């Protein structure tokens, strides 16, 4: 804990972003899931006309 | 005969307790060493990665964002449906 | 990472575009994924009468 | 940079043609209604 605390206190936001993405990766590993988006969301932005 | 066989059990069971006790202690020591070394590895990797992000902030990100979302949508069944929906009593 | 940054800092929008269009191909790769749409949506606009 | 719109349009069409050739589809008017798996 001491080592980590001395580590990450240079940019709180970046350590927040990372170590969260790897959480999603390691959590959604199992195929058992189902997920209901909406086409007007953000990640699927580039699916409209142009 | 029963009394002496019970005495044999009494004199035999106790040492293996010392055996297993030493084993559990040594396994705890191994855990300690492994945890601290992994901590050093992670801190070093982040230390190396940070400055190049403090070089170019905006495009360091969206690449990482997309690269994680590719896998997160990789392994989940998905049902794309429009919104304004009312109810879903499966 | 720095090589990526120096390369792709030429035009952000085009990179985002092409990278998303290549992520889509790998995402929905042989998996049951129902999709409800309208003939009034964007992409099917040439199914109308003229 | 030579000609943006035409290459952009062609890329859109090609990639979505590939993506819609793997996913099952049901095409219904979405003016009102609801359903469950």
């Amino acid at each position: 804990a001491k080592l980590f605390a001395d580590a990450f206190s240079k940019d709180p936001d970046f350590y927040a972003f990372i170590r969260s993405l790897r959480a999603y990766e390691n959590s959604f590993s199992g195929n058992q899931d189902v997920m209901v988006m909406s086409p007007d969301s953000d990640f699927f932005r580039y699916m409209k006309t142009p | 005969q029963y009394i002496r066989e019970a005495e044999a059990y009494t004199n035999e069971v106790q040492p293996r307790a010392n055996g297993q006790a030493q084993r559990i202690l040594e396994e705890a020591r191994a855990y300690k060493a492994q945890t601290i070394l992994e901590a050093q590895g992670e801190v070093a990797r982040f230390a190396k990665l940070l400055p190049e992000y403090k070089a170019a902030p905006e495009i360091t990100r969206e690449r990482l964002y997309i690269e994680t979302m590719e896998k997160v949508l990789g392994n989940t069944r998905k049902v794309l449906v429009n919104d304004k929906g009312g109810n879903l009593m499966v």
Side-chain angles (χ1 to χ4, degrees), chain B residues 1-19 21-90:
Chain B
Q1 160 201 10
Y2 284 157
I3 304 301
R4 65 178 64 88
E5 61 86 20
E7 182 65 26
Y9 181 85
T10 296
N11 221 17
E12 190 276 331
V13 64
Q14 188 274 331
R16 304 213 303 269
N18 297 31
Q22 183 62 255
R23 194 181 270 300
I24 191 167
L25 262 183
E26 190 68 27
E27 178 260 320
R29 186 180 296 275
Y31 182 108
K32 189 224 181 181
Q34 184 178 2
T35 292
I36 189 168
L37 275 172
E38 282 189 352
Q40 304 213 271
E42 289 291 325
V43 61
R45 190 215 280 277
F46 184 12
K48 195 37 160 36
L49 181 80
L50 183 63
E52 61 86 20
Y53 174 102
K54 288 185 183 293
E58 227 29 75
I59 207 144
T60 26
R61 231 67 260 235
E62 204 267 337
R63 187 273 305 277
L64 275 166
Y65 169 33
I66 300 298
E67 190 276 331
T68 195
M69 294 299 291
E70 190 277 331
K71 296 183 290 294
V72 75
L73 282 72
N75 290 318
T76 69
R77 283 82 58 85
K78 61 205 74 61
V79 162
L80 201 53
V81 171
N82 189 359
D83 194 358
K84 297 117 242 352
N87 67 304
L88 239 114
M89 11 194 353
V90 302

Side-chain angles (χ1 to χ4, degrees), chain A residues 4 8 12 14-27, chain B residues 38 42 45-46 49 61 64 68:
Chain A
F4 274 41
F8 304 121
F14 192 67
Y15 175 67
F17 208 84
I18 301 299
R19 166 81 270 185
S20 188
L21 269 48
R22 214 181 70 231
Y24 297 6
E25 183 178 1
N26 296 358
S27 75
Chain B
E38 282 189 352
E42 289 291 325
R45 190 215 280 277
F46 184 12
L49 181 80
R61 231 67 260 235
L64 275 166
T68 195

Side-chain angles (χ1 to χ4, degrees), chain A residues 1-9 12 14-47:
Chain A
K2 182 67 181 294
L3 181 57
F4 274 41
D6 281 15
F8 304 121
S9 168
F14 192 67
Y15 175 67
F17 208 84
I18 301 299
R19 166 81 270 185
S20 188
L21 269 48
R22 214 181 70 231
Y24 297 6
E25 183 178 1
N26 296 358
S27 75
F28 276 48
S29 70
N31 70 304
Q32 293 82 17
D33 199 329
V34 61
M35 172 180 176
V36 177
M37 321 275 308
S38 70
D40 203 3
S41 167
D42 186 74
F43 175 53
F44 303 88
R45 220 191 302 106
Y46 302 145
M47 184 154 309

